[PDB]
Design a binder for this molecule. Structure first.
Ligand code: CL
Ligand code: CL
Length: 162
């Protein structure tokens, strides 16, 4: 298992524009297009992202290309963030994947708001971080995914994904 296979399980793959768990137009492997309620705005963001006239449909290679860019961007957002970088550098390889998963889903600003959890993760107080991570809108809106990510931070293994 790795970050790509992990996010592919958590996000799925859809080749036509869909609404994500928040109701936002998304495509591919959790690639958010726009938070605007307009499907035309979505289609236009999609054409710009792919570089051709898509009419709301992309190929699998195209979905995987966006996915590669989004994973790369998530990692880069962590390393550029003063609150996230020292935590990420402190973690082993598996728990680093959990951090990337969170940033991918909710963005670098959202995750940087888990101040208390980040501190517990940095201190390797795994069971305590896990309890604190779950007291979140994140956990209450998407409990099955959040449980898998939290289990990954708690154990440092891929058990929740096998
Ligand atoms: Cl893009
Ligand atoms: Cl979920």
């Amino acid at each position: 298992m790795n970050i790509f296979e992990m996010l592919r399980i958590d996000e799925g793959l859809r080749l036509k524009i869909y609404k994500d768990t928040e109701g936002y137009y998304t495509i591919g492997i959790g690639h958010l297009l726009t938070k605007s309620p307009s499907l035309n705005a979505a289609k236009s963001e999609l054409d710009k992202a792919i570089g051709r006239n898509t009419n709301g449909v992309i190929t699998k290679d195209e979905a995987e290309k966006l996915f590669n860019q989004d994973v790369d961007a998530a990692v880069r957002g962590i390393l550029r963030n003063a609150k996230l970088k020292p935590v990420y550098d402190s973690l082993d390889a598996v728990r680093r994947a959990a951090a990337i998963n969170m940033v991918f889903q909710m963005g670098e600003t959202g995750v940087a708001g888990f101040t208390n959890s980040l501190r517990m993760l940095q201190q390797k107080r795994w069971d305590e971080a896990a309890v604190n991570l779950a007291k979140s809108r994140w956990y209450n809106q998407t409990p099955n995914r959040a449980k898998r990510v939290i289990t990954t931070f708690r154990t440092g293994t891929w058990d929740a994904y096998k």
